[PDB]
RNA sequence: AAUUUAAUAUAACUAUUAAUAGAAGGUUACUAAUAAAUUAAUAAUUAAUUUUAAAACCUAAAGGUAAACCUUUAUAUUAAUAAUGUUAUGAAUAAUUAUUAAUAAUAAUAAACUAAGUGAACUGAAACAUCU
RNA sequence: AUCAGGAAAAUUAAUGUAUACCGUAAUGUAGACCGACUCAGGUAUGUAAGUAGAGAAUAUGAAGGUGAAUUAGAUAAU
RNA sequence: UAAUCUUAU
C-alpha cells in the first residue's frame, strides 16, 4: 500500500444509505453469515432455540 | 580371459543430430576433443581410469585360516608409475601401469604399438586415458603420412575485399565470421 | 470513480445482455495506436472496478460479483488484444522471411507487374503505395531502397 | 555550484513548469501494462492532500 | 436462483 | 478475565484457535533476522554502491508509455447489438500467420488503398475473409 | 469479511483440494451447505459441474421466452413461458403458472406491496420434466439444420419436431436490448477498420512494445541447430 | 405411459487373462489466454489428421542464495546510417532517439523392472566357530 | 604486566547524482517466545526520578505500569 | 646410475 502526496486536495464522495444502494448494504450478508454460524454450530436442544 | 567389467558398461545412446533439428536443453560449452570410447569410463576401480591397467580390476575375496574362518580381503594389481618413450609423439609418456601391461608393452616393442593394436581385446583393456593416448598417436601418424597437400592465403586475400563489399551494402564483417562462412566452400 | 459515485448500484452498472467483450477478429482490423488506447481504457475500467470490488469484499462481505465479472470480461478483451498484437508481428516476420527467399519474391514481383501495372482498361497511386509497401521510399537510404529505385526505373523503361 | 537536494528540487520545479514529468523518465518502455491499483479511503492519520 | 428472481421482480416493479 | 463472556476455563487460547501448525511454509519479508532480506521483485533498477548506497540506472527503469492521442470512443466493451465477428482463412494452411495471405493483403492494399472490409463496412455482417 | 484473499492466489494447493472435492464425498460436502442455507435460498435440484453444463443452445432444448407445458409435478398440465435458466443447476425458472413454493422471506428481500413475510417463489425445473408447445405439445425436438438469426445474432440450429423434420418449432424472438452505457462502444466505431497490411519493410507495431506482447526470455521457445553446433556436439 | 431386474459413466481400488503402449508438482499473483487449416459424413457441425499462439517465479548444475529471492543487464552491445543539441577547427569528438546487420542463453523429470560393484546380521544347525 | 593481543577492501581532475528494494504494529524477566497448559522454570542488550549511602547493597518511590479465568464467608482438628 | 622415490623453484 503506497501513500502519495499531491498538490491539490481530495475528499471521497459520501458513502450511500442502506435504502439507496443495493450492494453497499452490509445487513444481508452479515445476517446470512450469522445464520450459517447458528446452524452449523447448533448442536442439541439449541435446534429448538429460536433464530436471531 | 574375459572383459566383463569393461564390456558390461553401457552409455546413453546419443541421438544423431540433424542440422535443421531443434537444440537439446544442455549443449556443452567446449566441443568434443577426442572420439567416444566404446566402453565409456570405468565406474568401479576409478583408480584405473587414469592409467593403463590392462583390464585388471581390483578383486575382492576371502582370507581363509586353518580354522576356515573367512574374512573379506582385496587383491590389488601391481601398479607402477612409468615414463615410457613414444616414438610418434617424440616424448616419454608417464602413467600408472600394471607390471603385466609393462611386460606386454615390452613384448610388442613400444608404447605406441601397444596403443594402436587393432584387436578388440586391446581396445577393451585400454582405459579412457589409453584410448585418448591411442587417438593422439594415430592422429599424429596420419599427419606424418599425409600433410594437407601431397587455400588459407586465398581466404586471407578475399577476406578484406569481402568486408569492403559488406560495408558498401551497409553491414560490418569480422574474420571469425568469414572463416565460419567459408569452411565448407 | 464513475460519475463521482462511491459505488455503482445495479442500475448504474452496464447490464450483461447489453454488453459484450471484443471479438479477436474485430480487434485484428484496428490500428496499433487505437489498440493501445483501448487497452488503457480497459485498464482504467479495471482500476475503477477493482477499487469498488475491494470495498465490496473487504467491508460489506458481499458475494454479488457483478464488478468481478466485468473485470474478468475486460481481462479477456485485453489478452485477446495482446494475442492479436503478437499475431500481427508474427505474420509480418513470416512475410519478411518469404520475401527473403529470392525466387518467391521475384515471382511475386512478376505477378504484380502482369495484372495491375503495365495494363489498360491510378497507376501512379499504385506505385506510391507499392513503393511504401515493398521498399523504404516515402515522399531513408539502404540496399532495399536502391533495389526499389532500380525496379521503378525498370518499370518506367518498360512503360 | 549547488548541492544535490537543491538541484533535484530545481529539476522537479522545472518539470512542473513544463507540464512534462516532474521526474526523470526511465528507458524500459512498458507499452501494455497489466497492473491495476486500488484507490483506498483515507485514514485519520492522512490529510486531504494525500491518497493511498 | 432466488436472488436472480428477486432482482428480476425488482426490475419489473421499477419499470 | 481475558474475555468477560468466558468466565470458566474452556480450552480456548489467549489468541487465535490453535498454537500448533505447519512450520514448513515459505518465508515472507516480515520474518527472519535483521540480515534476512527476501525482496518482492520490485527493484532490479540501479546498482548497489561500494559504501552501501544505491545508484539508479534510468535506462533500466520502467516507464508506462501511453498513446499521445487517446481514442476515447473505443470502450472496454462492445455494444451487444453488434454480432461477434468471425474470420475465415480457406486456402491458407498457415491461417492468419500465413505469408501467402499477407502477400495477398499487401497486393490488395497496393491496388485499392485502404478499403474497409465486409465486417468493417456493414455491422450486420458476421463472417469475413480478413 | 476483512479478507484480502481476493487480491491474490495464496494457499493454492489447499484451494484446489477444497474446490475439486471427490465426487463420491459430494453428499457429505453438500449436506452441511444445505443446512447452512435458509429455506428461501436453497434449491432441491443438483448443482451440476461446469463440464456437464448446457452451454450451447442445442444442449438446452428450450430458450428463455418460449412457451412450455409442465409435467411430472404438482402443477402438471400447465402452460408456462420460461423466464430464465439457471446455469449451475441446468434448469429453468418459469413464470407464475409454473411450479412454486411458499416460503418466509426477510424484509431485506420484500417486494413493494407485501403484507406477510410469506411469499410464493418459483422453483427450478429440469428440461426433462417439461415439454414444448405450439394448441399442441411436442414430445421431443431434434436439430438438423442451422442458420444466422437476425435478432439473436448467432448461427442457431433449427428446432424440428422429432420424426417429421419439416415441422419447425421456431425460436422465441427476444426483447430489444436498448443499450445506453458509457462503457460500450457503438457499432460504427467498434468495427471501423483503421489497420491494413501494407508494409513489408516497416513492422506494424514498434520494437519497444514487443516485450509486453511476448516474453523474450521464454524457456519454451527452443533454438534451432546449426552445422557448427552439430560439429561441436558430435565427437 | 410408469415400475422393477441385469449391464453400461466422464466417477473406486485389488487379483487374473487378453490386447495395446513405454510415463509434472509447488509458490503467488501486474492470474500463467489461443488461433487456424484440410478431409470424409449429415452453412453450423461432431470425428480424424495437421499447423499455430501465449505460458510469471521455484524445483542442484547463467552466477549466487536461508526453494518460490537476489545479481548478471538481449526494452544489451558492436557497427552502419538518419534526426537532434554542445565543444574545437566544409571535416573532427562525445551524448540521446529510431531503423538495419552481427553476437549468447533457459536440466522439474519419474518409479518399478534390468545389469554391474560392495555386501551384512538376526536366524538355522535345538550350543557354536566350518556351514547356513 | 605477560598470557605478547583478528582478517580483508590508492589519489587528483573532468563529467555526473531526479536518490531503488526490505525491516518499522504490539508483545519481549512474557497471557503475545522455548517448556504438552494464559506453566512461580528457561530467555540477549541499553536507560533505569530524587532522597541515603562505599555501592547497581538496603529503605522509600517521582513518574510509569499493574492489582490477575475464580469469588464470598468462616478461620475446628490439622 | 636416463631403476625407483622425496623436496623446492
Ligand atoms: Mg510441534
Ligand atoms: Mg521478527
Ligand atoms: Mg538503507
Ligand atoms: Mg534450476
Ligand atoms: Mg548475502
Ligand atoms: Mg547385484
Ligand atoms: Mg543357533
Ligand atoms: Mg548362547
Ligand atoms: Mg518491534
Ligand atoms: Mg514502536
Ligand atoms: Mg516494552
Ligand atoms: Mg511464565
Ligand atoms: Mg509456544
Ligand atoms: Mg511440562
Ligand atoms: Mg535510585
Ligand atoms: Mg505513584
Ligand atoms: Mg508491560
Ligand atoms: Mg490468578
Give G52 CA → H8 C1' in Å: 19
Asked if F51 CB < 7 A from strand I, the reply is: no
Residue B57 burial (C-beta neighbours within 10 Å; 0-12, 13-18, 19+): middle
φ, ψ (nearest 5 deg) of residue G180: -140, 75
CA separation for the pair G29, G20 (Å, rounded): 11
Distance from the Cα of B168 to chain C's closest Cα (Å) equals 9
Under DSSP, the state recorded for F30 is: S
CA separation for the pair G235, G231 (Å, rounded): 8
Q: Which residue has the cell 463496412?
A: F121
Number of C-beta neighbours around residue A47 at 10 A = 9
Q: Which residue has the cell 503506497?
A: A2
Nearest to G94 by CA among G109, G76, G107: G76
Nearest nucleotide over every DNA/RNA strand to the F127 CA, judged by C1': H43
Nearest to C132 by CA among C145, C150, C118, C115: C145
Q: CB of B70 within 8 A of CB of B64?
A: yes
| CA distance from start to end of chain D | 37
Please name the residue of chain D whose CA is at the shortest distance from the CA of residue A12. Answer: D41
Interface touch F82/G179, C-beta < 8 Å: no
Interface touch F60/D24, C-beta < 8 Å: no
Q: CB of G12 within 8 A of CB of F26?
A: no
Residues contacting residue B166 through CB under 8 Å, at least 6 positions apart? B172, B173
Interface touch A40/G106, C-beta < 8 Å: no
Distance from the Cα of D27 to chain G's closest Cα (Å) equals 10
Interface touch D30/F63, C-beta < 8 Å: yes
Nearest to G133 by CA among G173, G88, G80: G80
Helix or strand or coil: residue B63?
A: strand
How far is residue B156 from each of residues B160, B167, C42, C149, E1, measured CA to CA in Å? 7, 17, 60, 35, 84
CA separation for the pair G165, B54 (Å, rounded): 89
Instruction: Say how far residue B160 (Cα) sits from the centre of its chain.
Output: 39
User: Which H or E run includes G26?
Assistant: helix G26-36
Residues comprising chain B, all counted:
185
Under DSSP, the state recorded for F17 is: S
Instruction: Say how far residue C63 (Cα) sits from the centre of its chain.
Output: 37
Asked if B83 CB < 7 A from strand J, the reply is: yes
User: Which H or E run includes B138?
Assistant: helix B128-145
Residues from chain B contacting residue C142 (CB–CB below 8 Å): 170
Interface of A with D (CB under 8 A): 1-12
All 3 cell numbers of residue C113? 507487374
Nearest to C48 by CA among C80, C19, C14: C14
Instruction: Say how far residue A42 (Cα) sits from the centre of its chain.
Output: 22
Nearest to B3 by CA among B85, B173, B149, B126: B126
Helix or strand or coil: residue B61?
A: strand
User: Which H or E run includes B144?
Assistant: helix B128-145
Q: CB of F65 within 8 A of CB of F59?
A: no
Asked if F10 CB < 7 A from strand I, the reply is: yes
Nearest nucleotide over every DNA/RNA strand to the G14 CA, judged by C1': H26
Q: What is the DSSP string of chain C?
A: -BTTBSS--TTTSPPTTTEEPPPHHHHHTS-HHHHHHHHHHHHHHHHHHHHHHHHIIIII-----HHHHHHHHHHHHHHHHHHHHHHHHHHHHHHHHHHHSHHHHHHHHHHHHHHTTT----HHHHHHHHHHHHSS-----SHHHHHHHHHHHHHHHH-
Nearest to D36 among C36, C46, C82 (CB): C46
CA separation for the pair A19, A30 (Å, rounded): 16
How far is residue B165 from each of residues B16, B154, B171, C158, measured CA to CA in Å? 38, 17, 9, 30
CA separation for the pair D30, C79 (Å, rounded): 16
Nearest to B74 by CA among B39, B43, B53, B44: B44
Residues from chain D contacting residue C36 (CB–CB below 8 Å): 31-32
- D29 beta partners: F63
CA separation for the pair G137, G131 (Å, rounded): 7
Nearest nucleotide over every DNA/RNA strand to the B25 CA, judged by C1': H107
Angle between helices C123-134 and C143-158 (to 10 degrees): 160
- D24 beta partners: none
Q: Which ligand is nearest to the CA of B26?
A: 4
All 3 cell numbers of residue G33? 451447505
Distance from the Cα of G115 to chain C's closest Cα (Å) equals 26
Interface touch C85/G195, C-beta < 8 Å: no
| CA distance from start to end of chain F | 76
Residues from chain A contacting residue D52 (CB–CB below 8 Å): 1-4
CA separation for the pair C49, C66 (Å, rounded): 10
Q: CB of C93 within 8 A of CB of F74?
A: no
Nearest nucleotide over every DNA/RNA strand to the F29 CA, judged by C1': I22
Q: What is the DSSP string of G192-232?
A: --------SSS-SS-GGGHHHHS-TT-SSSPPBP-HHHHHH
φ, ψ (nearest 5 deg) of residue C48: -60, -50
Asked if B82 CB < 7 A from strand J, the reply is: yes
Helix or strand or coil: residue G191?
A: helix
Residues contacting residue D12 through CB under 8 Å, at least 6 positions apart? D22, D23
CA separation for the pair C81, C73 (Å, rounded): 13
Nearest nucleotide over every DNA/RNA strand to the B84 CA, judged by C1': J2
Instruction: Say how far residue F26 (Cα) sits from the centre of its chain.
Output: 25
Instruction: Say how far residue C96 (Cα) sits from the centre of its chain.
Output: 18
Angle between helices C66-100 and C102-115 (to 10 degrees): 90
CA separation for the pair A3, G142 (Å, rounded): 62
Region of residue G111 (left: phi > 0; alpha: psi -120 to 50; beta: else): beta
User: How big is chain B by its Cα radius of gyration, in Å?
Assistant: 25
Q: What is the DSSP string of G74-140?
A: SSTTEEEEEEEEETTTTEEEE-TTS-EEEEE--GGG--SS-SSSEEEEEPEE-TTTEEEB---B-S-
Positions of E strands within F28-116: 47-48, 54-55, 62-64, 77-79, 86-87
CA separation for the pair F39, F27 (Å, rounded): 11
Nearest to C6 by CA among C69, C48, C39: C48
- B124 beta partners: none
Partner C contacted by F79 (CB < 8 A):
yes
| CA distance from start to end of chain A | 38
Partner C contacted by G186 (CB < 8 A):
no
φ, ψ (nearest 5 deg) of residue C9: -70, 175
Q: CB of F60 within 8 A of CB of F45?
A: yes
Residues from chain C contacting residue F99 (CB–CB below 8 Å): 91, 94-95, 97-98
Interface touch B32/G232, C-beta < 8 Å: yes
CA separation for the pair B59, B72 (Å, rounded): 11
CA separation for the pair G207, C92 (Å, rounded): 13
Residue G160 has, within 13 A of its CA and on its CB side, a CA count of: 13
Residues contacting residue B19 through CB under 8 Å, at least 6 positions apart? G225, G226, G227, G230
Give B156 CA → H32 C1' in Å: 52
Technique of determination:
cryo-EM
Angle at C120 (CA atoms; ends C114, C125), nearest 5 degrees: 80
Region of residue D4 (left: phi > 0; alpha: psi -120 to 50; beta: else): alpha
CA separation for the pair B31, G59 (Å, rounded): 61
Residue D21 has, within 13 A of its CA and on its CB side, a CA count of: 7
Instruction: Say how far residue B155 (Cα) sits from the centre of its chain.
Output: 32
Instruction: Please tell me the distance between residue G123's alpha carbon and the centre of ligand 6 in angstroms.
Output: 71
Q: Which nucleotides of H are covered by protein (CB under 7 A)?
A: 1, 10-11, 25-38, 42-46, 51-57, 66-82, 96-103, 105-108, 115-120, 129-131
Distance from the Cα of D41 to chain C's closest Cα (Å) equals 9
Show contacts of E5-14: CB within 8 Å, 24+ apart. Answer: E5/G93, E5/G121, E5/G122, E6/G109, E6/G111, E7/C10, E8/G83, E8/G84, E9/G111, E10/G111, E13/G111, E13/G112, E14/C11
Positions of E strands within chain F: 47-48, 54-55, 62-64, 77-79, 86-87, 127-128
Amino acid at each position: 500500500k503506497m501513500t502519495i502526496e499531491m498538490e491539490e486536495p481530495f475528499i471521497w464522495p459520501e458513502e450511500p444509505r442502506p435504502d439507496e444502494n443495493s450492494f453497499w448494504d452490509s445487513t444481508t450478508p452479515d445476517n446470512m453469515e450469522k445464520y450459517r454460524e447458528e446452524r452449523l454450530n447448533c448442536l442439541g436442544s439449541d435446534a429448538n432455540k429460536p433464530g436471531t | 580371459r574375459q572383459w566383463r567389467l569393461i564390456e558390461t558398461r553401457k552409455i546413453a545412446k546419443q541421438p544423431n543430430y540433424q542440422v535443421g533439428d531443434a537444440k537439446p536443453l544442455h549443449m556443452p560449452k567446449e566441443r568434443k576433443k577426442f572420439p567416444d570410447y566404446k566402453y565409456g569410463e570405468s565406474n568401479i576401480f576409478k583408480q584405473s581410469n587414469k592409467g593403463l591397467y590392462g583390464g585388471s580390476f581390483v578383486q575382492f575375496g576371502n582370507n581363509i585360516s586353518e580354522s576356515k574362518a573367512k574374512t573379506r580381503k582385496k587383491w590389488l594389481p601391481n601398479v607402477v608409475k612409468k615414463g615410457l618413450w613414444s616414438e610418434t609423439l617424440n616424448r616419454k609418456i608417464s602413467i600408472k601401469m600394471t607390471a603385466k601391461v609393462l611386460k606386454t608393452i615390452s613384448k610388442e616393442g613400444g608404447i605406441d604399438n601397444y596403443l594402436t593394436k587393432e584387436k578388440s581385446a586391446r581396445i577393451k583393456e585400454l582405459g579412457p586415458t589409453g584410448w585418448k593416448l591411442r587417438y593422439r598417436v594415430l592422429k599424429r601418424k596420419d599427419e606424418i603420412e599425409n600433410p594437407p597437400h601431397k587455400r588459407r592465403r586465398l581466404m586471407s586475400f578475399l577476406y578484406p575485399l569481402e568486408k569492403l563489399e559488406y560495408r558498401s551494402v551497409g553491414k560490418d564483417l569480422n574474420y571469425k565470421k568469414f572463416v565460419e562462412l567459408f569452411a565448407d566452400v | 470513480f464513475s460519475n463521482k459515485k462511491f459505488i455503482r448500484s445495479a442500475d448504474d452498472l452496464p447490464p450483461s445482455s447489453h454488453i459484450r467483450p471484443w471479438s479477436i477478429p474485430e480487434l485484428r482490423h484496428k490500428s496499433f495506436n487505437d489498440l493501445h488506447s483501448l487497452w488503457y481504457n480497459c485498464l482504467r475500467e479495471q482500476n475503477v472496478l477493482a477499487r469498488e470490488n475491494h470495498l465490496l469484499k473487504n467491508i460489506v462481505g458481499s458475494t454479488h460479483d457483478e464488478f468481478s465479472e466485468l473485470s474478468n470480461s475486460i481481462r479477456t478483451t485485453m489478452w485477446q488484444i495482446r494475442h492479436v498484437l503478437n499475431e500481427r508481428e508474427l505474420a509480418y516476420s513470416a512475410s519478411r522471411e518469404f520475401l527473403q527467399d529470392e525466387s518467391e519474391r521475384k515471382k511475386f514481383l512478376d505477378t504484380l507487374a502482369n495484372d495491375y501495372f503495365l495494363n489498360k482498361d491510378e497507376v501512379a497511386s499504385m506505385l506510391t503505395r507499392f513503393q511504401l509497401a515493398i521498399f523504404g521510399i516515402s515522399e531513408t537510404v539502404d540496399i532495399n531502397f536502391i533495389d526499389g529505385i532500380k525496379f521503378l526505373a525498370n518499370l518506367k523503361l518498360q512503360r | 555550484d549547488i548541492n544535490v537536494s537543491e538541484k533535484i528540487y530545481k529539476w522537479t520545479k522545472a518539470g512542473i513548469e513544463q507540464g512534462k514529468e516532474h521526474f526523470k523518465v526511465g528507458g524500459n518502455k512498458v507499452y501494455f501494462p497489466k497492473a491495476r491499483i486500488i484507490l483506498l479511503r483515507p485514514n485519520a492519520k492522512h490529510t486531504p492532500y494525500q491518497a493511498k | 436462483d432466488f436472488m436472480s428472481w428477486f432482482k428480476r421482480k425488482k426490475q419489473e416493479e421499477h419499470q | 478475565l481475558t474475555r468477560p463472556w468466558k468466565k470458566y476455563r474452556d480450552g480456548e487460547l489467549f489468541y487465535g484457535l490453535s498454537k500448533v501448525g505447519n512450520k514448513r511454509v515459505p518465508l515472507t519479508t516480515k520474518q527472519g533476522n535483521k540480515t534476512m532480506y527476501k525482496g518482492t521483485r520490485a527493484s532490479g533498477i540501479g546498482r548497489h554502491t561500494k559504501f552501501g548506497g544505491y545508484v539508479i540506472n534510468w535506462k533500466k527503469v520502467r516507464t508506462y508509455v501511453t498513446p499521445d492521442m487517446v481514442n476515447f470512443e473505443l470502450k472496454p466493451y462492445v455494444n451487444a447489438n453488434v454480432p461477434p465477428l468471425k474470420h475465415e482463412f480457406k486456402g491458407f494452411s498457415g491461417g492468419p500467420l500465413d505469408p501467402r495471405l499477407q502477400l495477398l493483403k499487401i497486393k490488395e492494399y497496393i491496388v485499392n488503398g485502404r478499403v474497409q472490409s465486409e465486417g468493417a463496412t456493414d455491422t450486420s455482417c458476421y463472417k469475413e475473409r480478413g | 469479511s476483512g479478507s484480502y484473499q481476493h487480491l491474490s492466489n495464496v494457499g493454492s494447493r489447499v484451494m484446489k483440494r477444497l474446490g475439486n472435492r471427490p465426487k463420491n464425498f459430494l453428499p457429505h460436502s453438500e449436506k452441511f451447505i444445505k443446512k447452512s442455507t435458509p429455506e428461501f435460498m436453497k434449491s432441491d435440484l443438483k448443482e451440476v459441474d461446469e463440464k456437464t453444463s448446457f452451454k450451447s443452445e442445442k444442449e438446452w432444448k428450450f430458450i428463455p421466452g418460449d412457451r412450455v407445458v409442465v409435467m411430472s409435478g404438482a402443477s402438471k398440465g400447465n402452460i408456462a413461458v420460461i423466464k430464465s435458466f439457471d446455469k449451475r443447476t441446468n434448469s429453468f425458472i418459469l413464470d407464475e403458472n409454473g411450479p412454486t413454493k411458499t416460503v418466509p422471506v426477510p424484509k431485506q428481500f420484500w417486494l413493494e406491496g407485501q403484507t406477510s413475510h410469506m411469499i410464493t417463489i418459483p422453483v427450478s425445473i429440469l428440461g426433462k420434466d417439461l415439454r414444448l408447445v405450439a394448441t399442441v405439445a411436442v414430445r421431443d425436438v431434434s436439430f438438423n439444420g442451422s442458420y444466422y438469426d437476425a435478432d439473436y445474432k448467432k448461427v442457431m440450429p433449427y428446432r424440428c419436431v422429432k420424426g417429421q423434420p419439416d415441422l419447425i418449432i421456431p425460436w422465441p424472438k427476444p426483447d430489444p436490448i436498448d443499450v445506453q452505457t458509457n462503457l460500450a462502444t457503438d457499432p460504427v466505431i467498434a468495427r471501423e477498420q483503421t489497420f491494413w497490411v501494407d508494409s513489408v519493410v516497416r513492422n506494424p507495431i514498434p520494437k519497444k512494445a514487443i516485450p509486453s506482447i511476448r516474453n523474450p526470455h521464454s524457456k519454451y521457445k527452443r533454438g534451432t541447430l546449426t552445422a557448427k553446433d552439430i560439429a561441436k556436439l558430435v565427437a
